[PDB]
Ligand binder design. Structure first.
Ligand SMILES: [Cl-]
Ligand SMILES: [Cl-]
Ligand SMILES: [Cl-]
Ligand SMILES: [Cl-]
Ligand SMILES: [Cl-]
Ligand SMILES: [Cl-]
Ligand SMILES: [Mg+2]
Ligand SMILES: [Mg+2]
Ligand SMILES: [Mg+2]
Ligand SMILES: [Mg+2]
Lengths: 284, 283, 283, 284
């Protein structure tokens, strides 16, 4: 059989990487490549945020700050000394770093407890119109349970797996059709990166359909890694949803390549491959 | 010359082709199992760190480590994929054990009262669908306490010879094929009896591993094996062939590394799992 | 087209052949200098960790890091060669500074009272034979306080443009070759004025670096440079050519890595130092 | 010019590696490869003991335990999870591990303070005739200042650089002649590994003269690394001074090889090369 494609949907290929990944201007400094703040990693799940951090740094973000439990700062710096670190208890400093951010990612390893809830509320309250805000993992669950309302939804990006999306959209998985998914995207006014074997991105335009991904990537940290890549991309590249699609595509391209040799693809190997892959596509 | 026993089954690469399946296209991480690894007191925390690296690299979908909070930092520096729970975190520890598909207890665990209490809790809650691997000092604790098995057929012990002597009451001299088999039967569990040619006793005919080398005779080799067994049970068919494939792969990689390496660092075996498993994955 | 200034000297590989000497057969580690690196508060500890890796890989004989005790663990995980002293350890800190051949203060240092007190102590004790490199926030602190230089000719400042504006009082618009040179003269120190083409102002004719690329425009690149400068001054002739060679090598490695790497991790530059330096070592 | 050699002195070559590094018997277990205890690393100098630990593990020691400040246990396990760890405060446990050891190394990063002094005295008091005891670095200085006397000197190995040897032997560097060095070795009844550009080993037999070493190795940690190799060798191989000479030779062979490509030879690179080098010489 030949493939079947849905009309009104953009199927992703290397084309998206050529479009999104631009050659850096010779007059650039690190501030031109964005300030990212990554928020997550409670005391049980600190490795999640460490994996997002490695992805963000390796994707080319200019400056990366991590708000995470102080417990996690040691191993984070052992792996990623490029990252700056702020503890959850550091109320004023964490507010300062969020205020300065170009991109905020909240959710990897964040958990569901009262501290997690408080930090999410502070971030949602503090969010500025021009800042990208990526809500991932347990932050989606808390968002849906806290009956919040988004002030500036147009630069919010949710990255749910199917059960997180059920919770956010109230669409049972059986009802998560292209039409229904799009309608529920429209109701939020935000971008939905609906993760699956073939991730789909819903937004104000024609949806993007990812064409990669493999079950060798079905391991803890793959999603944390993707979230970090998305954040690093939004930090550096044009503020359009194509940039998010480029991140999603590159994540699965690298993972698909690694799976050719690796039965399970360690998520940190995708991050470590970013600089060489991005160089190959950088639009000259 | 070799002495062969007619009832004995000799492992080869065939076991890997049988056990290691191609993953289905529609799989998600929960399909490849939730593993809980329990061990690593304040002296021996490296042991659980080595088991964890083996488990993650073997392809387990999710890995949580219950170990002294002292060890959480170095563990995450090496293995950020792992989730971590301290020995003091009683409610959380209980929850993660309850949710696990495979529980490994023992690497670096030591012999203290906290170790006995967690073993007690794990054994009390053991569910029929869960695999429980009891390794190292946890075997000593099990044998010395009045601990019993509700579902022995889902329990795997991984003793060295002195641990088997404690568990089976067979002195090393008396550890013959027939006597070993008889004491397995009495337990109703799988016994991975570690030696130069590790032998696996179970309800069927015993398996003997044909590999292994003294370049692997270094601290951590057994902790590594235990993590591979855990990861294999998390992903593959619930049969003793799955356990045999873990044992065989561990020594295959070790034997290959020993061709170039005088001593084989146990973490190198773990690091080679993804490439070896791809090679043998039943296509 | 390029604009050339007749008084300006353009760096090339010749500077490396001049600076990087073959080590004498009878050398010991103290011959390659004692470096003290001072920085890394609780938010920015990675910065001092990156300077330390650069310093060690550059060939400094002994490296001690004065940084918050929070940072000592990850630093040793990455750089076990480094010795570590906390900010609170006042007698020991004073001793290591006294014994140093080269002192670098600033990477990740922040602006708090402890940072001001240590800067004060370093400046007060500065010995004529010691090199002192003042980097990052330490430049801000120096300029805002009533700090002065007893031996300015052994002091190197490494400002970005806004730090130079604070130190020299020249707004960016006014930062011309002539004005920059005049404010160097007023200080009597070496100014490594970081930009796309870093320019070094000193008592002689200025040097301009000819390399550098936006793949290096990431957090840590400057912390790395500062460690290379420190290591070079610890080992090589006490002249401004030594500083120029550090600047040039840093960007040579970065420019080479950028051929394959979209962003150049600063730690990769550090890791490449031993192989690059061997290649250029004046035979 | 052709070389000049001293009569009554064995000049080392790969021959020593073939002699010392034996093929392991197929019936071996980890206990056959010795229990080593490494003691050092105060709060300032913890990296020293971490470097000795990596050398010891990579050299093939069966089991390695480190008695070091608890501060150091995290980074030690991040690099060397094979090692077991005991804090200086753990009086009973540290005594237990020393009692069981086949080889004790004391001194890398140990420092000179009261805790260092106490631990050295405990170890010297506890030493058993059959145990190898390597006294390195600041432990040599403390040994010389504490006017100690060795109970079983024949299995003590001192590893001084020239100024440490001046302190131990009272020979000014000018007076450190072959004859004088040997006489002062004889007075102690111990092995002296007198480290230099061309390390010399004095003992009850003809001295060994190392023929390698280079100034690319003149960096902090080189000596800590050597001490760990010596300890791992004594753990596994025949209890003769040739074993110590083999360790010293291999350390400089690897360092000399690495210096061909590396301006400075990171000491941890020597350790990481041990398994491949030892395989090449293992006497079949
Ligand atoms: Cl985690
Ligand atoms: Cl994930
Ligand atoms: Cl404990
Ligand atoms: Cl601070
Ligand atoms: Cl150290
Ligand atoms: Cl040393
Ligand atoms: Mg702003
Ligand atoms: Mg359940
Ligand atoms: Mg002095
Ligand atoms: Mg004994």
């Amino acid at each position: 059989h030949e493939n079947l494609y849905f009309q009104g949907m953009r199927y992703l290929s290397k084309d998206i990487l050529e479009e999104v990944i631009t050659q850096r201007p010779s007059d650039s400094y690190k501030s031109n490549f964005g300030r990212v703040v990554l928020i997550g990693g409670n005391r049980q799940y600190g490795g999640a945020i460490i994996m997002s951090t490695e992805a963000c740094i390796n994707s080319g973000a200019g400056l990366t700050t991590v708000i995470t439990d102080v417990k996690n700062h040691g191993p984070l710096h052992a792996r990623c000394p490029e990252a700056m670190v702020v503890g959850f208890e550091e109320t004023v400093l964490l507010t300062n770093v969020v205020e300065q951010a170009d991109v905020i990612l909240i959710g990897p390893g964040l958990g569901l407890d009262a501290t997690a809830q408080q930090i999410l509320k502070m971030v949602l309250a503090q969010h500025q119109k021009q800042q990208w805000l990526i809500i991932d993992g347990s932050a989606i669950t808390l968002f849906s349970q806290g009956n919040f309302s988004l002030t500036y939804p147009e630069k919010v990006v949710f990255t749910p797996h199917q059960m997180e999306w059920q919770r956010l959209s109230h669409l049972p998985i059986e009802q998560q059709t292209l039409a229904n998914n799009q309608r529920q995207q429209a109701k939020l006014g935000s971008t939905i990166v609906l993760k699956s074997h073939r991730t789909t991105i819903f937004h104000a335009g024609e949806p993007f359909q990812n064409t990669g991904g493999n079950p060798g990537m079905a391991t803890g940290g793959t999603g944390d890694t993707l979230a970090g890549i998305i954040a690093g991309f939004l930090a550096q590249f044009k503020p359009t949803i194509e940039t998010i699609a480029g991140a999603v595509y590159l994540h699965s391209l690298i993972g698909d390549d690694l799976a050719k040799t690796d039965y399970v693809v360690l998520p940190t190997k995708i991050s470590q491959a970013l600089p060489t892959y991005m160089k190959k596509y950088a639009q000259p």
